[PDB]
Design a protein around this ligand. Sequence first.
Ligand SMILES: O=C([O-])C(=O)[O-]
Ligand SMILES: O=C([O-])C(=O)[O-]
Ligand SMILES: [Mn+2]
Ligand SMILES: [Mn+2]
Lengths: 302, 303
Amino acid sequence: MKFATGELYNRMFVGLIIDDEKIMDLQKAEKKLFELETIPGSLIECIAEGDKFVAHARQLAEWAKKPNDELGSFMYSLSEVKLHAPIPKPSKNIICIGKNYRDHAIEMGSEADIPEHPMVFTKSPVTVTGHGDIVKSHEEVTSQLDYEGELAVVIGKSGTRISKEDAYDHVFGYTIVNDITARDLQKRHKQFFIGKSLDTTCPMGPVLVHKSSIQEPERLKVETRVNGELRQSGSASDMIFSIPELIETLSKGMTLEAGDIIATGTPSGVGKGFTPPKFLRSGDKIDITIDPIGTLSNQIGL
Amino acid sequence: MKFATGELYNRMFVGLIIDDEKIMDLQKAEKKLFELETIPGSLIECIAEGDKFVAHARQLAEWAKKPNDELGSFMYSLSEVKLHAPIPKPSKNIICIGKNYRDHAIEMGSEADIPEHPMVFTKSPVTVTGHGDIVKSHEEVTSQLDYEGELAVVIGKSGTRISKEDAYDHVFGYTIVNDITARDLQKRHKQFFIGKSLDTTCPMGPVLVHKSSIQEPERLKVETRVNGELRQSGSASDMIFSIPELIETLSKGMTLEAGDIIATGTPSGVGKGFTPPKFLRSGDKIDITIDPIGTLSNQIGLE
Ligand SMILES: O=C([O-])C(=O)[O-]
Ligand SMILES: O=C([O-])C(=O)[O-]
Ligand SMILES: [Mn+2]
Ligand SMILES: [Mn+2]
């Protein structure tokens, strides 16, 4: 169950990946197969409907593989579809965790500055972009752009005061995020927001995998490649605060709403961590891979 | 000229204050005066429309001073209407400036930290609440809940890399914000977001005054009272980083969009400024007054 927001012939649509290299237009499929119109037009609204939307989508895929002659209405080959971020316009800023991998904390010069409590900041929705999109280099405000491959969690059911025991029941699914950061701007304003919120600096996608397809988030692996070179490799089992601990902490006095996006922190290997620091430049290709979500690819603009 | 989001008969509506005793339901007013329905149902959508919305609103105001068979179908007493926050659901987190009054920086930490560049963080949209609404104490999370009266600026026109010269051209207007903060969580999580983003901890309002009505905001003045006792009195000319400088800084690598809210920093006098520390408790009544916007009033709730 992989969901996406695709664009094809001037139509933005909520899509479900069929068998890899095909994508189903859920609204159009519902009208032709189920004769009805009940699927909303954005993925964040579908997430609000929770499990019943997901099951509705599976039934639609099942009926579509059954013989019929309407497939041309709603079956698109992925090669012909531009994938936006699964949630192109979040309702709120992306919630981000800092220094959630021990090695990355050390990398930024700490081992004393390993947080004992989640360090949490946000990225403005104006940073959100999709698979294959060009990230503005922002040469004018910074010469220290950095990449951050991260696993992202999307809340699928609202709640406050959520226990770590109930946390996964408030999760819709998982996607990839590149937390692109201006390291100089990060120091300048002392709060991470401005250096984390430059335009286009949050690639997200390529798809949003429902949690029912990832039973063990602990085993996911994040791999970041810059110009083909492996530079990050981290296991979600090694992050200091687990996803249920993060949800319990984030929601202690704050309501998490369906569609909220949580970036759980990048592993070691970021560009600033190299002696002879490696910063991003125009033309750098960035590939982040988390199976079974896929690979999120972006280029820094030239 | 003051816009608001009111509620009457289980319907939220964009409203215009008339003579500070009445509020005009712009949608219903357009309906029985021109028999068209073009005015959007949210203030942030109206802000996105540009000066044509403000002009249409002026026109509806005038056409109604005109004799009325059913003025009451779109004109209401403010006494009978509940005011929500002017923007009840921001499209993004509220942008907040830290340490913008020199005497507030000194009362929270020393001089050594005052910023040479704006220190900027945010409050989650779930923080927004309205004039007269009850603010949750969140006692099972914090006991260091503090008050911050601030002037808020609302962006009326999308822009990136706005020069300080063109900044006011991108402003819709002004409102009051209470940046209620949990001081301990602020320290615990080291980044301000968690301590600043507890449910109901950003009262906003009571109205949004269009910039045309407030040409000189250097002369605005923020007064905060807790249970009747005056505790904050700042002048907007005392800000490090004026409104135009803030807009130029924020928008330089980042698009500011219509409806975006910028809290410009609280002045001296917060509860943590007190040596035996003050801290809000249940039943505390906080009033923040900025004229011409009005007074924003909220009460801390029970545990
Ligand atoms: O600070 C961050 O953004 C992180 O740790 O991923
Ligand atoms: O830091 C703050 O929130 C302020 O000074 O207004
Ligand atoms: Mn990050
Ligand atoms: Mn503040």
